[PDB]
Design a binder for this molecule. Structure first.
Ligand code: FBT
Ligand code: HG
Ligand code: ZN
Length: 258
């Protein structure tokens, strides 16, 4: 039926309606530290989120998305492995039912408690819809979350979750600064891949940051209170909305550090 993360319609079943699930550049992948090739030609990332305008937040049944106004070059990403300018359109998380699982990408087989994705599209293409039809259409910045001390800048998001508990609900979310979710260093690993949920299109340049941000037990606990179901249906806790690591096949992961 419509895709999900449960026993009967989870990741292992997606290939039935989305054949691309067995493609050559699928995500996510495990990052083997000793095999990633340090590439010194890679340039440093350029994150310009000072003029970012958040609009709303909404539960879509798979995760929650904070949307931003992408009609002009307000919050952009360039540099690193990129060619051209990429506009931020939205961010979301992937998390688990226990502290030792939740991230999509792994490092030396290690699983973190969750993972943040900041989605951007190539301005060359005009709009998001066109960008998803190109090999270099999207650029997603990935950040790992580990359980420890509380992240001040995450709290604003934690507070509003009660108002978007079930599928379809949305709430205004203006004046949020995404710069409060970044770790100290911008060191990364990069590889060519795809969306981690259907339609599983292969249009993404993945940029996974080395340094994870830490959040509190209580902060992630509130993530686990959301619901997959819409209002009035039986309650199914929104947890473990992550895709298992896919085979790397004929690709290479480059690192911007040694
Ligand atoms: N999770 S993900 O980053 O790959 C992702 C996006 F960025 C955008 C749409 C769907 C989706 F699944
Ligand atoms: Hg594509
Ligand atoms: Zn994602």
């Amino acid at each position: 039926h419509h895709w999900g993360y449960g026993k009967h319609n989870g990741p292992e079943h997606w290939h039935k309606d989305f054949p691309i699930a067995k493609g050559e550049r699928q995500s996510p992948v495990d990052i083997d530290t000793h095999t990633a090739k340090y590439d010194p030609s890679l340039k440093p990332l350029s994150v310009s989120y000072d003029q970012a305008t958040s609009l709303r937040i909404l539960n879509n049944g798979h995760a929650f998305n904070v949307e931003f106004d992408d009609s002009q070059d307000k919050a952009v990403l360039k540099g690193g492995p990129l060619d051209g300018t990429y506009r931020l359109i939205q961010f979301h998380f992937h998390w688990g039912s226990l502290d030792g699982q939740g991230s999509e990408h792994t490092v030396d087989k290690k699983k973190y408690a969750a993972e943040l994705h900041l989605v951007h599209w190539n301005t060359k293409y005009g709009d998001f819809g066109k960008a998803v039809q190109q090999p270099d259409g999207l650029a997603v910045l990935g950040i790992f979350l580990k359980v420890g001390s509380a992240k001040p800048g995450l709290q604003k998001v934690v507070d509003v979750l009660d108002s978007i508990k079930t599928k379809g609900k949305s709430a205004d979310f203006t004046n949020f600064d995404p710069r409060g979710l970044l770790p100290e260093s911008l060191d990364y690993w990069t590889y060519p891949g795809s969306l981690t949920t259907p339609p599983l299109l292969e249009c993404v340049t993945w940029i996974v940051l080395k340094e994870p941000i830490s959040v509190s037990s209580e902060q992630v606990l509130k993530f686990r209170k959301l619901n997959f179901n819409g209002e009035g249906e039986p309650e199914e806790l929104m947890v473990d909305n992550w895709r298992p690591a896919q085979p790397l096949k004929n690709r290479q992961i480059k690192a911007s550090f040694k």
